[PDB]
């Protein structure tokens, strides 16, 4: 169906991620606010309006309800504010400002790994806020992650302890796949370099059990690359060369349909060669 949700924002929207259950929608805009709507049963109810950022908010990401309904937001103010429910109202439970530049991407770790928030900032460093309990977060910043600055971070589904890995896409014209060593430190495992411009979004395809890890990335040049791992070997396959800049890429729940949104103010859905559905 169609659920036209009036954003009621004071500026242009930047992200819109719905909750895990598919009942609540959270959006962010340049007005330095992140108001969380309720879109249950085709409605537009403002559960809570949040204003704690000193600048525009780029991306938001809901957390798994198994660790509670928690929303994290990364803004231009080089600070990441983690919002949590407290007796039915949203409040800023924790704030992280360990980056010297604006944080552009935040994505919660898979529920199997735990409650880890991977923040990718433009300073070139990535920080992972691991929840140690009792309202205490442990930050293991990976300094100098990107040559210029990381613009996208995407976790990978739990595949076999757990070999925690995620894909980072920044302005270094390449994608860095980070692996969590047994000691605890995070080091790059493999570097993927096929884009000719700044990488804007990376989205690891959710794994359903197929022995094939799939990575979808988009860059500033307008090219969308699909990476597959049949080994740690990745063979990119150019999905399409869009006319304008491509902003975000998102996989389906079964990782068969990829949602590609670019600067042409259009949204395209691609299904497997890759053929557009829209």
């Amino acid at each position: 169906v169609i659920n036209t949700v009036d954003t009621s924002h004071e500026d242009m929207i930047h992200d819109a991620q719905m909750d895990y259950y598919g009942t609540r929608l959270a959006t962010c805009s340049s007005d330095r606010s992140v108001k969380i709507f309720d879109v249950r049963n085709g409605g537009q109810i403002l559960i809570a309006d949040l204003r704690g950022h000193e600048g525009p908010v780029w991306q938001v990401a809901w957390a798994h309800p198994m660790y509670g309904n928690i929303l994290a937001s990364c803004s231009y103010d080089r600070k990441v504010i983690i919002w949590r429910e407290e007796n039915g109202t949203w409040e800023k439970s924790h704030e992280h400002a360990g980056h010297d530049s604006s944080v552009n991407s935040v994505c919660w770790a898979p529920h199997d790994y735990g409650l880890i928030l991977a923040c990718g900032s433009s300073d070139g460093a990535i920080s992972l806020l691991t929840y140690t309990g009792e309202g205490q977060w442990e930050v293991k910043k990976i300094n100098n992650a990107h040559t210029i600055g990381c613009n996208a971070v995407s976790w990978a589904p739990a595949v076999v302890n757990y070999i925690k890995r995620f894909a980072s896409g920044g302005c270094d014209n390449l994608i860095k796949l980070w692996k969590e060593e047994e000691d605890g430190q995070w080091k790059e495992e493999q570097k993927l370099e096929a884009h000719s411009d700044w990488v804007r979004d990376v989205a690891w395809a959710p794994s359903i059990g197929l022995p094939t890890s799939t990575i979808a990335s988009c860059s500033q040049d307008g090219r969308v690359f699909i990476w597959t791992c049949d080994s740690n070997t990745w063979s990119p396959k150019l999905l399409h060369k869009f006319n304008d800049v491509v902003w975000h890429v998102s996989w389906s729940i079964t990782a068969n349909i990829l949602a590609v949104s670019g600067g042409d103010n259009k949204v395209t859905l691609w299904k497997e060669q890759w053929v557009c559905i829209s």
Binding site: V1, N3, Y20, Y21, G22, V160, P206, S207, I208, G209, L210, P211, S252, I253, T254, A255, N256, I257, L269, K271, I277
Partner: protein
């Protein structure tokens, strides 16, 4: 809402049933549910599974007794081909549900090899089947059918009561503030009307536990 573009349907997940006690009955119920939904290929696959999962086809302990139905082409080869086709279609729901249905039923080196060959699911590929089951449970949790998710995940390879004064061995509710508790049904019945602790300690257990 673009669920029509996905290989997983919420209606199919809600309509599916799981009972390890009787596999043919659950397979027939799943076939009926697929017919109600309208997916003919699911109907054919479920009827084939209904036929191929009957207890009359039980693998024998002795390898020399007969050829196990898994080694029969309509056994593992059918199931392997169906799993490959549904992996190509990326149908997580059907893959995991079929794996659960077929796993519910399920000289020394020769005996071990025979035990390996008598299973309609690959003993060396159980990690993939467990991954399918876990991912389908994740999708069911996404939909909200927690009971269905728990039922599917069951096939993954990996004090005295203060009301009736009967020893409690099963489900029990205990208040953390005061410490008096008993049978779950007894507490449900008692607290549906009153709000004071049955032991008489004066604790308002509803205001002390609920949240």
């Amino acid at each position: 809402d673009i669920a029509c573009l996905l290989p997983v349907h919420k209606s199919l997940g809600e309509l599916y049933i799981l009972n390890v006690n009787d596999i043919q009955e659950t397979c027939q119920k799943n076939a009926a549910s697929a017919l109600l939904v309208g997916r003919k290929d699911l109907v054919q696959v479920w009827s084939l599974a209904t036929v191929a999962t009957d207890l009359c086809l039980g693998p024998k302990s002795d390898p020399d007794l007969e050829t196990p139905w898994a080694r029969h082409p309509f056994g593992r080869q059918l199931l392997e081909s169906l799993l490959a086709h549904y992996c190509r279609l990326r149908d997580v729901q059907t893959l995991a549900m079929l794996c659960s249905v077929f796993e519910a039923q399920s000289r020394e080196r020769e005996r071990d090899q025979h035990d390996k060959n008598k299973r309609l699911l690959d003993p060396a590929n159980t990690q993939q089947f467990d991954d399918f089951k876990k991912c389908y449970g994740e999708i069911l949790y996404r939909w909200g059918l927690r009971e269905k998710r728990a039922e599917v995940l069951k096939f993954v390879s990996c004090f005295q009561c203060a009301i009736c004064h009967v020893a409690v061995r099963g489900s029990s509710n205990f208040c953390l503030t005061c410490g008096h508790g008993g049978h779950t049904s007894h507490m449900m019945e008692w607290f549906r009307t009153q709000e004071v602790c049955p032991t008489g300690c004066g604790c308002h257990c509803l205001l002390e536990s609920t949240f």
